[PDB]
Amino acid sequence: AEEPTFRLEFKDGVITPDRLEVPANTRFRIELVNTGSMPAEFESLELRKEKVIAAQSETVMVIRTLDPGEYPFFDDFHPGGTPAILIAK
Ligand SMILES: [Mn+2]
Ligand SMILES: [Mn+2]
């Protein structure tokens, strides 16, 4: 594996970890693991990125590149859940 790979757990709107530092200007992967009972949707407004993860399932999201900066994200299917963030640096 020559690509950095991170992991986020989604569980009924709670995202862990809620803060993820990632490299900027770099292609990388995030394993999105939904351990809850409802489908989840990774969504970031700024990045225009949305990815569904069915309950009790996993999918691996590819981020092609991020300019340095901070990118809030959340489970769009569970409003009021964790406001998480990617910190690209
Ligand atoms: Mn959505
Ligand atoms: Mn929404």
Numbering used by the authors: 44 to 132
What did the authors write?
Periplasmic FtrB from this system is coancestral with known copper oxidases, and the conserved D118 and H121 are predicted to bind to Cu2+, forming an active enzyme. On the other hand, we and another group predicted that periplasmic FtrB (10 kDa) is a novel cupredoxin (Cup-II) based on its common ancestry with Fet3p (a multicopper oxidase) and other single-domain cupredoxins.
The final refined structure (Rfree = 19.8%) at a limiting resolution of 1.30 Å was produced. For example, structural fold analysis of FtrB revealed the presence of nine β-strands, resulting in three β-sheets through H-bond interactions (Sheet1:1–2–4–7, Sheet2:3–8–9, and Sheet3:5–6). Interestingly, the electron density that can correspond to the presence of copper metal close to the D118 and H121 residues was not identified. This can be due to several reasons, such as the pH of crystallization being 4.6, where the side chain of H121 would be protonated and hinder Cu2+ binding (pKa for H121 in FtrB using ProPKA 6.5).21 Second, acetate being a competitive chelator for Cu2+ and being present in such a high concentration under the crystallization condition (100 mM acetate and 10–100 mM CuSO4). In contrast, diffraction data from wild-type FtrB crystals showed that two large peaks of unmodeled density above 5σ were found in the Fo–Fc difference map and could be modeled as two Mn2+ ions with high occupancy (Mn1 = 0.88 and Mn2 = 0.71) and low B-factors (Mn1 = 15.54 Å2 and Mn2 = 14.20 Å2). Coordination of Mn1 is mediated by side chain oxygen atoms of residues E84 and E86 (from the EXE motif), E93 (from the RKEKV motif), and D119 and two ordered waters, resulting in octahedral geometry. A second Mn2+ (Mn2) is found 5.3 Å from Mn1, near the loop connecting β-strands 5 and 8.14−16 Surprisingly, only a single coordinating ligand originates from FtrB (i.e., D119), with five oxygen atoms from ordered water molecules acting as the remaining coordinating ligands, resulting in octahedral geometry. Despite this flexibility, all FtrB conserves E86 and E93 residues, which are seen to coordinate to a Fe2+ mimic in our crystal structure, and we conclude that FtrB plays a crucial role in iron transport.
